Write an enzyme that holds these catalytic residues in place. Structure first.
Site, PDB file in Angstrom:
ATOM      1  N   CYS A 155       0.931  -1.113   0.000  1.00  0.00           N
ATOM      2  CA  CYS A 155       0.000   0.000   0.000  1.00  0.00           C
ATOM      3  C   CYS A 155       0.982   1.174   0.000  1.00  0.00           C
ATOM      4  O   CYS A 155       2.192   0.948  -0.068  1.00  0.00           O
ATOM      5  CB  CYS A 155      -0.898  -0.011   1.249  1.00  0.00           C
ATOM      6  SG  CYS A 155      -0.063  -0.074   2.820  1.00  0.00           S
ATOM      7  N   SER A 156       0.500   2.404   0.092  1.00  0.00           N
ATOM      8  CA  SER A 156       1.402   3.557   0.040  1.00  0.00           C
ATOM      9  C   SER A 156       2.687   3.411   0.861  1.00  0.00           C
ATOM     10  O   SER A 156       3.788   3.423   0.306  1.00  0.00           O
ATOM     11  CB  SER A 156       0.660   4.828   0.462  1.00  0.00           C
ATOM     12  OG  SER A 156       0.260   4.757   1.815  1.00  0.00           O
TER      13      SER A 156
HETATM   14  C1  LIG Z   1      -7.866   7.669  18.478  1.00  0.00           C
HETATM   15  O1  LIG Z   1      -7.926   9.071  18.265  1.00  0.00           O
HETATM   16  C2  LIG Z   1      -7.730   9.488  16.953  1.00  0.00           C
HETATM   17  C3  LIG Z   1      -6.457   9.774  16.476  1.00  0.00           C
HETATM   18  C4  LIG Z   1      -6.220  10.199  15.178  1.00  0.00           C
HETATM   19  C5  LIG Z   1      -4.795  10.509  14.706  1.00  0.00           C
HETATM   20  C6  LIG Z   1      -4.275   9.621  13.559  1.00  0.00           C
HETATM   21  O2  LIG Z   1      -4.818   8.587  13.232  1.00  0.00           O
HETATM   22  N1  LIG Z   1      -3.136  10.037  12.893  1.00  0.00           N
HETATM   23  C7  LIG Z   1      -1.825   9.345  12.858  1.00  0.00           C
HETATM   24  C8  LIG Z   1      -1.209   9.333  11.420  1.00  0.00           C
HETATM   25  N2  LIG Z   1       0.031   8.524  11.416  1.00  0.00           N
HETATM   26  C9  LIG Z   1       1.263   9.054  11.106  1.00  0.00           C
HETATM   27  O3  LIG Z   1       1.691  10.051  11.648  1.00  0.00           O
HETATM   28  C10 LIG Z   1       2.103   8.303  10.036  1.00  0.00           C
HETATM   29  C11 LIG Z   1       3.465   7.966  10.698  1.00  0.00           C
HETATM   30  C12 LIG Z   1       3.812   6.458  10.734  1.00  0.00           C
HETATM   31  C13 LIG Z   1       4.476   6.053  12.067  1.00  0.00           C
HETATM   32  N3  LIG Z   1       5.835   6.618  12.151  1.00  0.00           N
HETATM   33  C14 LIG Z   1       6.423   7.269  13.214  1.00  0.00           C
HETATM   34  O4  LIG Z   1       5.655   7.891  13.925  1.00  0.00           O
HETATM   35  C15 LIG Z   1       7.766   7.261  13.504  1.00  0.00           C
HETATM   36  C16 LIG Z   1       8.719   7.804  12.661  1.00  0.00           C
HETATM   37  C17 LIG Z   1      10.061   7.776  12.978  1.00  0.00           C
HETATM   38  C18 LIG Z   1      10.485   7.199  14.154  1.00  0.00           C
HETATM   39  C19 LIG Z   1       9.556   6.650  15.012  1.00  0.00           C
HETATM   40  I1  LIG Z   1      10.218   5.740  16.866  1.00  0.00           I
HETATM   41  C20 LIG Z   1       8.216   6.682  14.689  1.00  0.00           C
HETATM   42  N4  LIG Z   1       2.390   9.015   8.770  1.00  0.00           N
HETATM   43  C21 LIG Z   1       1.491   9.246   7.747  1.00  0.00           C
HETATM   44  O5  LIG Z   1       0.300   9.369   7.911  1.00  0.00           O
HETATM   45  C22 LIG Z   1       2.143   9.354   6.360  1.00  0.00           C
HETATM   46  C23 LIG Z   1       2.631   7.969   5.819  1.00  0.00           C
HETATM   47  C24 LIG Z   1       1.443   7.070   5.508  1.00  0.00           C
HETATM   48  C25 LIG Z   1       1.168   5.996   6.333  1.00  0.00           C
HETATM   49  C26 LIG Z   1       0.104   5.172   6.084  1.00  0.00           C
HETATM   50  C27 LIG Z   1      -0.733   5.383   5.005  1.00  0.00           C
HETATM   51  C28 LIG Z   1      -1.914   4.455   4.755  1.00  0.00           C
HETATM   52  F1  LIG Z   1      -2.529   4.073   5.927  1.00  0.00           F
HETATM   53  F2  LIG Z   1      -2.869   5.062   3.983  1.00  0.00           F
HETATM   54  P1  LIG Z   1      -1.460   2.901   3.852  1.00  0.00           P
HETATM   55  O6  LIG Z   1      -2.597   1.828   4.217  1.00  0.00           O
HETATM   56  O7  LIG Z   1      -1.446   3.103   2.377  1.00  0.00           O
HETATM   57  O8  LIG Z   1      -0.008   2.405   4.369  1.00  0.00           O
HETATM   58  C29 LIG Z   1      -0.454   6.463   4.175  1.00  0.00           C
HETATM   59  C30 LIG Z   1       0.616   7.293   4.422  1.00  0.00           C
HETATM   60  N5  LIG Z   1       3.308  10.223   6.373  1.00  0.00           N
HETATM   61  C31 LIG Z   1       3.697  11.290   5.602  1.00  0.00           C
HETATM   62  O9  LIG Z   1       2.855  11.674   4.809  1.00  0.00           O
HETATM   63  C32 LIG Z   1       4.897  11.921   5.652  1.00  0.00           C
HETATM   64  C33 LIG Z   1       5.801  12.032   4.613  1.00  0.00           C
HETATM   65  C34 LIG Z   1       7.004  12.674   4.783  1.00  0.00           C
HETATM   66  C35 LIG Z   1       7.340  13.223   6.002  1.00  0.00           C
HETATM   67 BR1  LIG Z   1       9.028  14.070   6.122  1.00  0.00          BR
HETATM   68  C36 LIG Z   1       6.452  13.135   7.072  1.00  0.00           C
HETATM   69  C37 LIG Z   1       6.729  13.707   8.455  1.00  0.00           C
HETATM   70  C38 LIG Z   1       5.264  12.487   6.859  1.00  0.00           C
HETATM   71  C39 LIG Z   1      -2.229   8.821  10.379  1.00  0.00           C
HETATM   72  N6  LIG Z   1      -1.737   7.968   9.430  1.00  0.00           N
HETATM   73  O10 LIG Z   1      -3.389   9.149  10.378  1.00  0.00           O
HETATM   74  C40 LIG Z   1      -7.312  10.341  14.336  1.00  0.00           C
HETATM   75  C41 LIG Z   1      -8.579  10.062  14.789  1.00  0.00           C
HETATM   76  C42 LIG Z   1      -8.803   9.640  16.081  1.00  0.00           C
HETATM   77  O11 LIG Z   1     -10.073   9.375  16.498  1.00  0.00           O
END
Ligand SMILES: COc1cc(CC(=O)NC[C@@H](NC(=O)[C@H](CCCNC(=O)c2cccc(I)c2)NC(=O)[C@H](Cc2ccc(C(F)(F)P(=O)(O)O)cc2)NC(=O)c2ccc(Br)c(C)c2)C(N)=O)ccc1O
Length: 303
Positions: A235-236
């Site tokens: 996936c992405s």
């Molecule tokens: C429960 O309460 C609630 C909480 C929320 C909040 C929520 O979900 N949001 C989190 C967010 N996740 C995020 O931030 C993630 C970060 C991944 C985890 N890493 C780390 O953290 C980390 C990094 C380095 C070292 C260490 I140690 C850890 N980033 C992201 O959301 C995306 C990557 C991504 C991941 C998954 C997907 C997908 F699910 F669609 P897929 O199925 O295709 O794979 C798509 C894109 N990141 C990026 O866009 C990106 C790109 C470049 C750079 Br520089 C940065 C800072 C970020 C997301 N993916 O959404 C929302 C609703 C609620 O109700």
């Protein structure tokens, strides 16, 4: 394999009470607890100078301990890196390779991995772009008879079939270096919504059954050897939908064999192989809901 039955697996009856006691918010809080845990392992290679541009997302590196290494060479100017991780399945080592959507500068790396790991099935869970967000490059020839050359590897499209919830493409990988050819089946799931999670898990689970059967068929016809080649799933970033597909496969496998499962266990374990697996609380909740929906469809639930 890290995915062994139990300790403390739950029956469907127990899962029902478990989810009812916590509700949607309780399950969301459970995901946050998993989320808070300190990752088990390091990410030095993925973040090392030279491999940075091979990552689609800087915030989604892969674990050093489980990364798939390419057996490239010297002089040609490159590394052995690809953002992909070996992942165990239910009582099966390296059942999958979870990876990001290939980038133009990693297409060759992707196919090299497919060849080296003797992969027979590839599972794609996204479109090239969704909501204006790029998620995957066009790494394979789309139409029948079309072909793409990646150095000493040539990939040709042998046929395409559109289903209501997925698309199946048969590919031929010709290695000109070794002078050998292999067939790989590429499956693209088409029913994951642009926003949120599937409203029903029926299509995803049926798709999983199709994938399972093809892998089984392909394995039966392959040469004597991986202990069973891994299924490439992407996936992405290779963590959200990839983690969901794999977690469901593992839970359903245990459910079919012993009538028990443990979502918390499976997801925690998976995150030690493909770091960050399951990206949102919604996806986490979906794992629970999908299993309960499956149970109802199988006539295992009394209200
Ligand atoms: C429960 O309460 C609630 C909480 C929320 C909040 C929520 O979900 N949001 C989190 C967010 N996740 C995020 O931030 C993630 C970060 C991944 C985890 N890493 C780390 O953290 C980390 C990094 C380095 C070292 C260490 I140690 C850890 N980033 C992201 O959301 C995306 C990557 C991504 C991941 C998954 C997907 C997908 F699910 F669609 P897929 O199925 O295709 O794979 C798509 C894109 N990141 C990026 O866009 C990106 C790109 C470049 C750079 Br520089 C940065 C800072 C970020 C997301 N993916 O959404 C929302 C609703 C609620 O109700």
């Amino acid at each position: 394999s890290v995915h062994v039955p139990g300790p403390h697996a739950m029956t469907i009856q127990e899962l029902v009470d478990y989810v009812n006691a916590r509700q949607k918010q309780g399950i969301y809080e459970e995901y946050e607890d998993i989320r808070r845990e300190n990752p088990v392992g390091t990410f030095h290679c993925s973040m090392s100078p030279g491999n940075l541009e091979k990552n689609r997302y800087g915030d989604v590196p892969c674990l050093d301990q489980t990364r798939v290494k390419l057996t490239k060479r010297s002089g040609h100017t490159q590394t052995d890196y690809i953002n992909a991780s070996f992942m165990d399945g239910y009582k099966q080592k390296n059942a999958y390779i979870g990876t990001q959507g290939p980038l133009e500068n990693t297409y060759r790396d992707f196919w090299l991995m497919v060849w080296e790991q003797k992969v027979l099935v590839i599972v794609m869970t996204t479109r090239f772009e969704e909501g204006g967000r790029r998620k995957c490059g066009q790494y394979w020839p789309l139409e029948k008879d079309s072909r793409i050359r990646f150095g000493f590897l040539t990939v040709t499209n042998l046929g395409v079939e559109n289903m209501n919830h997925y698309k199946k493409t048969t590919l031929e990988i010709h290695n000109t270096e070794e002078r050998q050819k292999r067939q790989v089946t590429h499956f693209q799931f088409l029913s994951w919504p642009d926003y949120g999670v599937p409203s029903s898990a029926a299509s995803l689970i049926d798709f999983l059954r199709v994938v399972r059967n093809q892998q089984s068929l392909a394995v039966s016809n392959m040469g004597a050897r991986c202990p069973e080649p891994p299924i490439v799933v992407h996936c992405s970033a290779g963590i959200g939908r990839t983690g969901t597909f794999c977690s469901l496969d593992i839970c359903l496998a245990q459910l079919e064999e012993l009538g028990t499962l443990n979502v918390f266990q499976t997801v925690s374990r998976m995150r030690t192989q493909r770091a960050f697996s399951i990206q949102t609380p919604e996806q986490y909740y979906f794992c629970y809901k999908a299993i309960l929906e499956f149970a109802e469809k199988e006539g295992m639930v009394s209200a």
